């Protein structure tokens, strides 16, 4: 029974190692998405300026 508790503890440590790494892959992705948000939002704001300006000039 003491042998089984040592084996069972090794599985739980592998669960934390995978959990720590999958959070890290998500954490790197979250910073990229926020930066891709502002680049798309600035692109949309510049586009809405150009559509309004071209009608105003004509």
């Amino acid at each position: 029974d003491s042998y089984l508790k040592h084996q069972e503890i090794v599985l739980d440590t592998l669960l934390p190692q995978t959990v720590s790494n999958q959070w890290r892959i998500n954490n790197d992705y979250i910073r990229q998405t926020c930066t891709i948000v502002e680049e798309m939002n600035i692109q949309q704001r510049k586009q809405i300026n150009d559509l309004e300006i071209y009608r105003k000039r004509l």
Partner: protein, 49 residues
């Protein structure tokens, strides 16, 4: 005569064991059941990793 002597000696050695072993069989088998859930959580985490 042997089935009288040995099996009554067997039932005494079993029930004296089963008062002690079936408590620690449940300590063994329920900890075996923790392994089959720690393995199933390991595969879906390694798949998501």
């Amino acid at each position: 005569t042997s089935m009288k002597i040995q099996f009554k000696t067997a039932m005494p050695p079993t029930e004296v064991l089963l008062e002690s072993i079936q408590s620690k069989v449940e300590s063994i088998e329920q900890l075996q059941r923790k392994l089959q859930h720690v393995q199933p959580l390991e595969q879906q985490n390694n798949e998501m990793c």
